[PDB]
């Protein structure tokens with residue numbers, strides 16, 4: 601472990617998002633910022649909102665620069681409108697550097713800020729191609745690398761607790777690590793396996809095979825990447841294209857058929873509860889996602905447990921029961937490897953070598969019988985044909 605200053609610098613959870621502490625302006629204004637690999641805009645609340653306890657005050661920053669331009673970002677459900685500008689930015693539990701970066705000062709928003717989340721802004725870590733208004737708005741990570749000696753790489757260890765946490769427990773507990781400029785070897789076990797970044801827009805990857813308890817889903821691999829497959833810390837669930845979702849749910853139901861669950865559970869709408877400590881993890885199957893490797897005709901696999909895809913939630917009666925929602929859902933915008941997936945792994949965003957590394961997380965939730973896995977190599981032909989165009 602050679603990045604001690606950055607270890608344990610995250611807080612939060614899969615459902616409301618993981619955040620890092622940052623400061624903006626002169627003198628520094630402290631804000632909690634959502635770490636999002638599924639967007640490319642750095643934005644902060646800059647006007648009072650019922651869910652914000654603090655916000656960026658441009659008139660109190662002597663280093664604030666007005667870009668005199670409007671900006672709008674529509675997300676999956678939420679959205680915001682704001683005003684573009686620049687300021688000095690630092691990450692207290694990050695590299696010991698200050699950079700001048702673009703900041704969208706949020707003036708209006710709908711279903712963006714989450715009550716009790718503890719975050720007041722969003723750090724879009726993806727590439728300029730998906731930045732709004734357009735690709736001329738340099739994302740924060742690009743500015744950081746260009747202005748400093750920080751290597752063009754970041755890595756994320758998201759730590760799911762495996763049980764519910766209220767707002768107060770979230771504040772008090774460590775939610776993970778964001779290592780800026782390096783790979784901290786204390787955050788994972790086993791080997792790091794790398795998948796290519798197909799195109800620099802979202803963090804786009806190629807899934808070449810899917811298994812449920814070792815049983816091949818047997819779909820044309822193009823289906824798994826229709827119309828794209830992305831790694832997104834800003835999305836909670838594992839989201840699958842409609843056809844893949846229907847086939848995966850049918851297979852997960854058949855594997856867990858010793859117990860019957862209502863349709864609302866499988867639709868990700870209603871919770872299922874079990875008496876304290878009796879969740880039957882063993883009846884639920886493991887899920888393997890095979891990803892294209894860096895060597896020609898070579899693949900590797902990442903394997904998750906129900907401890908990853910069953911999201912802990914507090915009971916409607918707040919009882920001693922262990923309650924969960926099914927964290928797999930349909931998508932009409934391709935595969936999304938969200939926070940519940942990422943929680944099983946140490947993920948290295950190697951922008952310099954246009955590749956994503958995965959290793960078993962030192963903080964993944966498991967039992968005495970099974971663990972999450974990263975294994976290879978596998979001989980896999982015609983992998984570039986799995987890519988949708």
Ligand SMILES: CC(=O)N[C@@H](Cc1cc(F)cc(F)c1)[C@H](O)[C@H]1CO[C@@H](OCC(C)(C)C)[C@H](C)N1
Nearest residue numbers: 616617638639675676677678711712730834835
């Ligand atoms: C749940 C969701 O919308 N997730 C958000 C973050 C976010 C987290 C949050 F807690 C509250 C939010 F309102 C927003 C991700 O950025 C998504 C947005 O859509 C896609 O990106 C589209 C754009 C590039 C932004 C135009 C891609 C799947 N990444």
